[PDB]
From TrEMBL, chains A, B:
One of its GO terms (molecular function) is dTDP-4-dehydrorhamnose 3,5-epimerase activity. InterPro entries: RmlC-like, RmlC-like_jellyroll, RmlC_Cupin_sf. Its EC number is 5.1.3.13. This is dTDP-4-dehydrorhamnose 3,5-epimerase. Catalyzes the epimerization of the C3' and C5'positions of dTDP-6-deoxy-D-xylo-4-hexulose, forming dTDP-6-deoxy-L-lyxo-4-hexulose. It comes from Oleidesulfovibrio alaskensis (strain ATCC BAA-1058 / DSM 17464 / G20). It catalyses: dTDP-4-dehydro-6-deoxy-alpha-D-glucose = dTDP-4-dehydro-beta-L-rhamnose.
Length: 157, 157
């Protein structure tokens, strides 16, 4: 796994198995080094050039895969006691050259947007299920999160 | 959950949460009545009008969701001692009116194909991870499995 400029954030390879009719795309196994605990599996559709930002969880860890389309993810370390406090991590997720698993640790702000001209499908396998009050949001232009979505290049070009 | 003409095969509702940028699509939680055990989560892309058939597992149970596109699934009960031995179950999976979770029990043959003119993305959350020798295949035209994919209407119309 590749470490990112935000402490605890990791990027790992996901296998695409070629097959007639279309490929098989891995995500996570019980024995995967990246697997910890099963909480929930859900999907998030992101229409092209649309932004979903910003989110933060108190305890939950995210495991993102993007089997359809392409997204730009931005991570912001708001953890006061983190050795990478105040830093950003920017990652591109999607086929065919960026099909990886992104680990987002708790208390790290995240946002993402679909690039190009077709929708993205983000899959998330979380370690705990969704529960009221365990997560926090901020407007996508929150001035305390040092990244401008309005300024982002979502052309995918 | 809706029972199907093949014993043990079930169909359950999956929530689509509306949201700006695109909806959130549920699949499975730890407390879901349909959850048993976490083995693996993978995806299968099916190009339009393409068929992936036939498969059978000795112990494994399948939990299919189709968050992108649309597929036609056919189930065939080859279990000699099943009260629905020899029967077929046909199901349509996909948004927006057929976004459900399909449970395929072990030792039931399955096949599926993408309808329409855009690809499908099938998600599968299995109770055990993939392992050599635990599954079996048959050509998509196997004459012992009483369904003709060649004759199927995959227009999606």
């Amino acid at each position: 796994a590749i470490l990112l400029p935000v402490e605890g954030a990791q990027l790992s390879e996901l296998r695409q198995i070629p097959a007639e009719g279309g490929p098989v795309l891995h995500m996570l196994r019980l024995d995967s080094p990246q697997f910890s605990q099963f909480g929930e599996i859900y999907f998030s559709e992101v229409l092209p050039r649309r932004v979903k930002a910003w989110k933060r969880h108190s305890l939950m860890t995210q495991l993102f895969a993007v089997p359809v389309g392409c997204i730009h993810v931005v991570l912001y370390d708001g953890r006061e006691k983190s050795p990478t406090s105040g830093r950003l991590a920017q990652v591109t997720l999607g086929r065919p050259d960026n099909y990886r698993l992104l680990r987002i640790p708790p208390q790290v702000w995240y946002g993402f947007a679909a690039t190009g001209d077709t929708p993205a499908l983000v899959a998330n396998c979380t370690d705990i299920p969704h529960r009221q009050g365990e997560s926090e949001r901020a407007p996508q232009d929150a001035p305390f999160i040092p990244f401008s979505w309005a300024g982002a290049d979502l052309s995918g070009t």
